[PDB]
Amino acid sequence: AYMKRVEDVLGKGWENHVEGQKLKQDGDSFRMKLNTQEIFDDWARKVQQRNLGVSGRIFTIESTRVRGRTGNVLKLKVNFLPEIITLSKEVRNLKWLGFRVPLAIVNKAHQANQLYPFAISLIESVRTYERTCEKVEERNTISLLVAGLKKEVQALIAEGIALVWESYKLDPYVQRLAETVFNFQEKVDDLLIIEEKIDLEVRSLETCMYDHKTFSEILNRVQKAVDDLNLHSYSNLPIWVNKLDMEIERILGVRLQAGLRAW
Amino acid sequence: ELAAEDEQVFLMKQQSLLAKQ
Amino acid sequence: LGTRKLMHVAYEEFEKVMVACFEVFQTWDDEYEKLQVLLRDIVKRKREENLKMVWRINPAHRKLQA
Amino acid sequence: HLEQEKHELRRRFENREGEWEGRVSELETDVKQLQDELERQQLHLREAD
Amino acid sequence: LEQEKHELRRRFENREGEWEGRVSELETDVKQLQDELERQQLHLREADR
């Protein structure tokens, strides 16, 4: 564009000008700097050097891991990390400039496209699953009640991992998966909120000093939350209630004996 | 007196790894 | 269909009429596709002569169907 | 098994279709380049003569 | 499943036959364009001579 400006300045005399001879040099070296065939070649290169097998990695849907950290844990992983960007790369080169793009890579990208959304849903389900497990095991009481749903999620996770590449039955598993983890997540969120209301009452049992009406009110509210727990039944709800009641008895008897002495 | 149910995470995962063959 | 009194008649008889008419178009479609396949079969042995086979067909009943 | 093979045939024939679309895209660009290079060399060497 | 499988196999074979036709047409067109470029460049060389 700047060259066009100078082409307008003198027409042809700007070329062999007093300083246009140097402008021409700056432009020529800058053209050699601005080259993309090197990048196109490196792209087709790398993709044809190691992404020849990266393309159709759709079979082994699930893959266990190893993560050298404290304890050296292992996670779950689906095999679609750079491939999706390669699909976008091909579409960009084709619509953008258009080359004699390697047709084999284009058709392998096509095969990745026709199975890609499934993998997206699976990957997000896995990530949400991991996030929920983080929240769950960061707590400890919750495990008692979540136990059933957590086993449910892992039941379908086991049924999903066990199979790899089910060309016929894929979509229903994906949808089942999404709803299970979706429910699961809502249950953890729901329970978290419930528990904190419970604990504000529990931790407030030493606040309203010696008023049976208020005590009664607190308890009623707490078990309203307990019927909420009953409906969407969690796992071992009465057991956790036994725990509650024991500590409630202790806060009660403690407030009692304190007031007993004062009275 | 049931001691109904409770499970793990990492355990189930690597156990399925051994089940992957 | 001009004799069937399409817009006059009740919705039920109209429906039966329209079902049979769509069957007519349907049979036209698939049986014509069979003829397309057979014509390509002959064409593969006829390609040595010409390639002026435009294959553009606007079967008159198109806007009638729409 | 019939459903397995059926879905596999559908997906594979769609892949083959993608290959055909690729072949057509090739020839499309090839025809474009050939026609352009054709006319340019034609008319410019004719005007040179 | 069996019926629809033979139907689908047949279907994709028909569509692919049409793909072969389109590709073959463009193949011949590419051949014609290449040959026209060759003979017209030769006409330009004969004109040069």
A98 CB-near residues (< 8 Å, 6+ apart): D29
Whole-angstrom distance, CA of residue A27 vs CA of residue E12? 54
D38 CB-near residues (< 8 Å, 6+ apart): E33, E36, E37, E40
From E17, E24, E25, residue closest to C37, measured CB to CB? E17
Q: Can you list the alpha helix ranges (DSSP code H) found in C1-66?
A: 11-46, 62-65
CB contact under 8 A, E14 and C47: no
Going by C-alpha positions, the residue among A143, A132, A124, A128 that lies closest to residue A234 is A143
Q: SS3 sequence, A89-122?
A: HHHHHHHHCCCCCCHHHHHHHHHHHCCHHHHHHH
E3 contacts D5 by C-beta, under 8 angstroms: no
Whole-angstrom distance, CA of residue A153 vs CA of residue A176? 10
List the single best residue of A95, A99, A103, A163 to mutate versus D (max D Cβ within 10 A): A103
Q: Which chain C residues contact residue E25 at CB under 8 A?
A: 51
How far apart, in Å, are the Cα atoms of A192 and each of A180, A181, A217, A231, C15? 18, 16, 22, 16, 57
A64 contacts B16 by C-beta, under 8 angstroms: yes
This structure's resolution (angstroms)? 3.5
Distance from the A162 Cα atom to the nearest Cα atom in chain B, whole angstroms: 7
Whole-angstrom distance, CA of residue A52 vs CA of residue A111? 13
Distance from the A171 Cα atom to the nearest Cα atom in chain D, whole angstroms: 12
Whole-angstrom distance, CA of residue A97 vs CA of residue A92? 8
| Helix (H) or strand (E) segment spanning residue A60 | none
How far apart, in Å, are the Cα atoms of A156 and each of A117, A172, A181? 20, 12, 10
**What is the sign of the dihedral through the CA atoms of A45, A46, A49 and A51?**
negative
Chain A from 165 to 224: CB within 8 A of any B CB: none
Other residues' Cβ atoms within 10 Å of the Cβ of residue B8: 14
From D10, D28, D49, residue closest to E48, measured CB to CB? D49
Q: Which two tokens stand for residue A58?
A: 């759709």
Indicate which technique resolved this structure: cryo-EM
Residue where the block lists tokens 């026609």: D35
Distance from the D43 Cα atom to the nearest Cα atom in chain E, whole angstroms: 10
From E9, E19, E36, residue closest to D9, measured CB to CB? E9
